[PDB]
Amino acid sequence: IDPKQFGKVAVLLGGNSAEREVSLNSGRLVLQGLRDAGIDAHPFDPAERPLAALKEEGFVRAFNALHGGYGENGQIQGALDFYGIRYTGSGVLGSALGLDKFRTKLVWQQLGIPTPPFEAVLRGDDYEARAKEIVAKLGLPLFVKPASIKVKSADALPAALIEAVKFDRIVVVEKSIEGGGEYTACIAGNLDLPVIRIVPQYLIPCGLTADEEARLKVLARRAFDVLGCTDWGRADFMLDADGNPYFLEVNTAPGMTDHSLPPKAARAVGISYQELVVAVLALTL
């Protein structure tokens, strides 16, 4: 790909979210890789510059290296769509739905994409009542995940429901999957990237058979695509003790630091950092 085909590129980085510092780190490295590949790239921090400057300064496309908040929830995607600026990763629906664990899991359940069973808790519920019904119906341990804390005993759940409804009007109480591990499949166009095991480090080889890895990647890519997400991201999943997968969530704005997942997945099969960034930007052509 001739670098001049990309035109003038903005690397979106920084922003106003809690994850600002990680985004600066991603962005600085994406910018450098693009510039090393000959691409006319420039940083653009939307916490500090007005979004209209993109059109006014002739930027034709953006590599989005923002994390969290408006960088990942469809807001900046919508605003860029409106200004005619192409960008990496998922459009408005994919991004909005991808950050919404509740609706992601409803879509999955209805389309047969396996995902851990769960109950919803809503700001204003009888917290003490629900806890009782939820532990009875689902078991322990549970995870309390605000839609947009691990709980191991029944009487600890109320306090966690009270606390988690402070962060979202909708709280997903999810059954924990035991005995298999946590994994992630990085998605970057048609690049064939290996499954990574996540140890709460990132572990390659993930320790599954090549056949299992191959079928889980197809399934992962489907879990991602059915939400409207396209081109670039991750799908996280648990395996139970027999190797049955359960998808947890997707990520539509993955880290691009030197210690982030996709660079580690890429390097493991001989794809350099620079090649990864160029290929992900290439999808916007």
Author numbering: 4 to 151, 159 to 210, 227 to 311
Original authors' sentences:
We used an “ortholog rescue” approach to maximize structural coverage of these gene families, which are likely to be essential not only in B. thailandensis, but also in related, but more virulent, Burkholderia species, such as B. pseudomallei. Using only seven Burkholderia species to select orthologs of essential genes, we solved structures for 49/406 essential gene families, and for 56 total Burkholderia protein targets (including seven ortholog replicates). Of these 56 targets, 25 satisfied criteria for being a potential antimicrobial drug target.
By using an ortholog rescue strategy for insoluble or difficult to crystallize targets, we increased our structural coverage of B. thailandensis essential genes from 31/406 (7.6%) to 49/406 (12.1%). Ortholog structures may also be useful in designing broad-spectrum antibiotics with cross-species activity, and by representing a variety of functionally conservative point mutations in the active site may be useful in developing drugs less susceptible to mutations that cause drug resistance.
